[PDB]
DNA sequence: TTTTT
């Protein structure tokens, strides 16, 4: 079947920067192209079809072109409200194929995380439970790695590690790591510390609390 | 306006079969085809097909074939997706989305979207425990619940901003998630703060105010 | 068979 090729996976931008993102086809499509807008949570909206056409209420920042195989969408000066996903679809006869996508982020100045860290809850410890939670919030880049250790060995098993999609008001990320163990194996041990490294330092930022306190 | 409802979420077992409903209003239900299209969790676009209301003819992407069936109704103006012997694979969010004016035009209205979970485990009630430690973050650790989703929120939305809800996690046929606040350590614990928790599918509501440890 | 519906 036709295949289509968007570059780049990820981008990052800031607004009132000029940017562009490309779609190719690996067979003539002529100008039959069509980009999505679809923003975190939301379902895709039409932006451009015949690769140059704007779809009603469009803004003119936005701007396609190409034709045959590679193709361009340019958008200029961007606006808070044009981050998200686009995805690119050829509408030269079925069946239609879409390309991976372009995740357009906003750029902003690095930031460490504010970490916090909680023991089990007392109402938990009475399943027979006990899951030790950080959150390391509002860091940017998204890069980051966080690391459980008890009295000094690190933890593997039983991490549970989710990330937040960016921030649409301060442009970082967040990320929630949980340390599940069993009540009788948490009562085994004193220190639990949540270590995460972030490119803003080069030493970890760290935050622990022991058991019996 | 064009509006396009579609059923709920659904939880089923591998190798059952499922069908959603698309129905549609704002236009000429027979006027424009009908594509659906799916989008696993984090991933990109993929057409399954269309069909035409006016002849209920259809067109389907080969690899859809024998797996996903298009049926419509003109007298509810309602178009119905037939998955058959559903695997982890078919777990995604499904969309109808109508045509453009004629059937090769690029889609332009998509629905807000169905989403499929396959899977043996059985649906189960959250646990909900509190997260207590010139702002303090607390939060609230929902888990062990199936399937999502659960809404989390804060005072019954008083509080929102500072939340930060993290994307639910698997693990074990369970999915577990976090949310944290950030207040103003003055205002707490002299003013409460409470999370709401819902889980639907096993007709749940849990609030859990966070008190000082 | 390619867009002011």
């Known amino acids: 079947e036709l295949q289509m090729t968007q570059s780049p996976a990820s981008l990052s931008a800031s607004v009132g920067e000029t940017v562009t993102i490309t779609c190719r086809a690996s067979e003539n499509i002529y100008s039959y192209l069509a980009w999505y807008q679809q923003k975190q949570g939301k379902s895709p909206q039409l932006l451009v079809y015949?690769?140059?056409t704007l779809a009603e209420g469009v803004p003119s920042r936005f701007s396609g072109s190409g034709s045959g195989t590679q193709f361009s969408l340019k958008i200029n000066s961007l606006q808070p409200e044009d981050f998200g996903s686009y995805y690119c679809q050829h509408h030269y006869g079925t069946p239609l194929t879409f390309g991976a996508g372009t995740k357009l982020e906003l750029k902003r100045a690095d930031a460490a995380p504010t970490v916090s860290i909680f023991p089990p809850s007392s109402e938990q410890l009475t399943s027979g439970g006990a899951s030790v939670v950080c959150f390391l919030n509002n860091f940017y880049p998204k890069d980051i790695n966080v690391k459980w250790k008890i009295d000094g060995s690190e933890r593997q098993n039983g991490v549970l590690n989710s990330w937040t999609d960016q921030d649409s008001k301060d442009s970082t990320y967040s990320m929630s790591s949980t340390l599940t163990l069993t009540k009788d194996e948490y009562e085994r041990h004193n220190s639990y510390t949540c270590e995460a490294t972030h490119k803003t330092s080069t030493s970890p930022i760290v935050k622990s609390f022991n058991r019996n306190e | 306006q064009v509006k396009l409802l579609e059923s709920g979420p659904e939880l089923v077992k591998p190798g059952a079969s499922v069908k959603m409903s698309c129905k549609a209003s704002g236009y000429t239900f027979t006027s424009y085809v009908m594509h659906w299209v799916k989008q696993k969790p984090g991933q990109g676009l993929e057409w399954i097909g269309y069909?035409?209301?006016?002849?209920?003819?259809?067109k389907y992407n080969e690899k859809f074939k024998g797996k996903a069936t298009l049926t419509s109704d003109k007298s509810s103006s309602t178009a119905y997706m037939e998955l058959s012997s559903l695997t982890s694979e078919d777990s995604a969010v499904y969309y109808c989305?109508?045509?453009?004016?004629?059937?090769?035009?690029?889609?332009?209205?998509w629905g807000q979207g169905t989403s499929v979970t396959v899977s043996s485990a059985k649906t189960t009630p959250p646990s909900v425990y509190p997260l207590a430690p010139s702002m303090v973050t607390l939060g609230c650790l929902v888990k062990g619940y199936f399937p999502e989703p659960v809404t989390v929120t804060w005072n019954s939305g008083s509080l929102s901003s500072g939340v930060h809800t993290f994307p639910a996690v698997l693990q074990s046929d369970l999915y577990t998630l976090s949310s944290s606040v950030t207040v103003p350590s003055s205002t707490w614990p002299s003013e409460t703060v409470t999370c709401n928790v819902a889980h639907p599918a096993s007709s749940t509501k849990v609030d859990k105010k966070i008190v000082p440890r």
């Open positions: 015949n690769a140059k």
């Open positions: 989305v109508r045509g453009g004016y004629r059937p090769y035009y690029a889609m332009d209205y």
């Open positions: 069909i035409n209301p006016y002849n209920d003819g259809t």
